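Task: complex structure prediction.
Instruction: return structure tokens for all chains below.
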Amino acid sequence: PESESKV
Amino acid sequence: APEGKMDLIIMRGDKGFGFRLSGATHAQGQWVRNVDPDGQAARAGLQAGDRLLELNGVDVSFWSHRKVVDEIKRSGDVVAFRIARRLSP
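Output:
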């Protein structure tokens, strides 16, 4: 995407 | 689009807070793209589309995606968010 991350 | 702000406090689970953050790699800010319905964020009421404004009482609306994520991971067992949420939808 533009910038994705799981947290 | 009118939005309202809300404060949230989320305990870390064993796989994390339970949501995928998404947004500007380098304001407007990062945002919640989806949330584990059985995870800790959902339990605290984070919802998809919630846009990140403050992390632990720090303005984080103008940060890079990785600085925000890293600080989220470094927050320890508890994190606090202030977010902006679409109201009409």
